[PDB]
Design a protein around this ligand. Structure first.
Ligand SMILES: [Cl-]
Ligand SMILES: [Cl-]
Ligand SMILES: [Cl-]
Ligand SMILES: [Cl-]
Ligand SMILES: [Cl-]
Ligand SMILES: [Cl-]
Ligand SMILES: [Cl-]
Ligand SMILES: [Cl-]
Ligand SMILES: [Kr]
Ligand SMILES: [Kr]
Ligand SMILES: [Kr]
Ligand SMILES: [Kr]
Ligand SMILES: [Kr]
Ligand code: NA
Length: 129
């Protein structure tokens, strides 16, 4: 599923990401924009042989099982394919675990490089939330 901007904002809010670990909703929308262009089916993969999945490009090195990432973990307790669903629940629940892991949203390199410190509220401007 390719979400619209406000559509994704609303879905993220319903799933409890607004202000989760202190990160306002625009942070999450901005991260999703640059990770996946709002496409749940995005994959990419990594040099190391891991793969990133879904709207927030969550990595199989630590977070999900894909059967083809040697030595990896599955800390979210999910198949990586669950991260590609039109239903964002698995991506949200796993993102909550990632952002709680000590480096906050810096876990997403694209958030650090493209969203952090910017006017992220612009990503939710106009939306009915
Ligand atoms: Cl957009
Ligand atoms: Cl915001
Ligand atoms: Cl594996
Ligand atoms: Cl393969
Ligand atoms: Cl594990
Ligand atoms: Cl699995
Ligand atoms: Cl959803
Ligand atoms: Cl933080
Ligand atoms: Kr909502
Ligand atoms: Kr929800
Ligand atoms: Kr996919
Ligand atoms: Kr891929
Ligand atoms: Kr998400
Ligand atoms: Na894994």
């Amino acid at each position: 599923k390719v979400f619209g901007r406000c559509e994704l904002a609303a879905a993220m809010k319903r799933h409890g990401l607004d202000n989760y670990r202190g990160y306002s909703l625009g942070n999450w929308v901005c991260a999703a924009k640059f990770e996946s262009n709002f496409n749940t089916q995005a994959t990419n993969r990594n040099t190391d042989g891991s793969t990133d999945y879904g709207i927030l490009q969550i990595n199989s090195r630590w977070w999900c099982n894909d059967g083809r990432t040697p030595g990896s973990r599955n800390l979210c307790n999910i198949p990586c394919s669950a991260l590609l669903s039109s239903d964002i629940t698995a991506s949200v629940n796993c993102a909550k675990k990632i952002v709680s892991d000590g480096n906050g949203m810096n876990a997403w390199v694209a958030w650090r490089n493209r969203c952090k410190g910017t006017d992220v509220q612009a990503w939710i401007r106009g939306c009915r939330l």
